[PDB]
């Protein structure tokens, strides 16, 4: 149903035994995304 | 000094006193990796490629980097080890009087 794939598609061992990739057009890796914390502030009166 | 990014990173990370740093904090401008130059139209190319891609899955490439390509200088940290005020640094104060 398709002749080529134009999308972000990582290359690994399982996919390379059936289809053929090319030279990567983007070098990257894996990372973790987490939610930031509230910076907050503690300064109200000079009696601190 | 303009050279390849896989060597200049290692030299900066293995230099005493942290007196050499890389512009852009590890910035590249023509991304092309290494490789093995097999003879053209060889029969070993497909078997070698599947072997290299296998090492990534098992995590056997990061261990090699940790064993060989590890440095000690923390050039990533930007905390400058103190500074000395000079005329150019202390220029606004005088021009306030100006």
From Swiss-Prot, chain A:
It is found in: Cell membrane; Postsynaptic cell membrane; Postsynaptic density membrane; Synaptic cell membrane. It comes from the Eukaryota. Coiled coil: none annotated. Glycine binds at residues 8, 10, 15. NMDA is probably regulated by C-terminal phosphorylation of an isoform of GRIN1 by PKC. Its phosphorylated state is influenced by the formation of the NMDAR-PPP2CB complex and the NMDAR channel activity. Component of N-methyl-D-aspartate (NMDA) receptors (NMDARs) that function as heterotetrameric, ligand-gated cation channels with high calcium permeability and voltage-dependent block by Mg(2+). NMDARs participate in synaptic plasticity for learning and memory formation by contributing to the long-term potentiation (LTP). Channel activation requires binding of the neurotransmitter L-glutamate to the GluN2 subunit, glycine or D-serine binding to the GluN1 subunit, plus membrane depolarization to eliminate channel inhibition by Mg(2+). Belongs to the glutamate-gated ion channel (TC 1.A.10.1) family. NR1/GRIN1 subfamily. It is linked to Neurodevelopmental disorder with or without hyperkinetic movements and seizures, autosomal dominant: An autosomal dominant neurodevelopmental disorder characterized by severe intellectual disability and developmental delay, absent speech, muscular hypotonia, dyskinesia, and hyperkinetic movements. Cortical blindness, cerebral atrophy, and seizures are present in some patients. Heterotetramer; the NMDAR subunits are modular and harbor tiered domains that function in concert to regulate opening and closing of the cation-selective ion channel pore. Forms heterotetrameric channels composed of two GluN1/zeta subunits (GRIN1), and two identical GluN2/epsilon subunits (GRIN2A, GRIN2B, GRIN2C or GRIN2D) or GluN3 subunits (GRIN3A or GRIN3B) (in vitro). Can also form heterotetrameric channels that contain at least two GluN1 subunits and at least two different GluN2 subunits (or a combination of one GluN2 and one GluN3 subunits) (in vitro). A hydrophobic region that gives rise to the prediction of a transmembrane span does not cross the membrane, but is part of a discontinuously helical region that dips into the membrane and is probably part of the pore and of the selectivity filter. The extracellular N-terminal domain (NTD) is a site of allosteric regulation to modulate overall receptor function. This is Glutamate receptor ionotropic, NMDA 1. The gene is GRIN1. The chain holds residues 509 to 556 of 938 of the full protein.
UniProtKB/Swiss-Prot annotation, chain B:
It is found in: Cell membrane; Postsynaptic cell membrane; Cell projection, Dendrite; Late endosome. L-glutamate binds at residue 4. Component of N-methyl-D-aspartate (NMDA) receptors (NMDARs) that function as heterotetrameric, ligand-gated cation channels with high calcium permeability and voltage-dependent block by Mg(2+). Participates in synaptic plasticity for learning and memory formation by contributing to the long-term depression (LTD) of hippocampus membrane currents. Channel activation requires binding of the neurotransmitter L-glutamate to the GluN2 subunit, glycine or D-serine binding to the GluN1 subunit, plus membrane depolarization to eliminate channel inhibition by Mg(2+). The extracellular N-terminal domain (NTD) endows NMDARs with a unique capacity for allosteric modulation, harboring several binding sites for small molecule ligands that act as subunit-specific allosteric modulators of ion channel activity. Phosphorylated on tyrosine residues. Primarily found in the fronto-parieto-temporal cortex and hippocampus pyramidal cells, lower expression in the basal ganglia. Changing residue 97 to V: Found in a patient with autism spectrum disorder; uncertain significance. It is linked to Intellectual developmental disorder, autosomal dominant 6, with or without seizures: A disorder characterized by significantly below average general intellectual functioning associated with impairments in adaptive behavior and manifested during the developmental period. MRD6 additional features may include seizures, hypotonia, abnormal movements, such as dystonia, and autistic features. Developmental and epileptic encephalopathy 27: A form of epileptic encephalopathy, a heterogeneous group of severe early-onset epilepsies characterized by refractory seizures, neurodevelopmental impairment, and poor prognosis. Development is normal prior to seizure onset, after which cognitive and motor delays become apparent. Belongs to the glutamate-gated ion channel (TC 1.A.10.1) family. NR2B/GRIN2B subfamily. It comes from Homo sapiens. This is Glutamate receptor ionotropic, NMDA 2B. It comes from the Eukaryota.
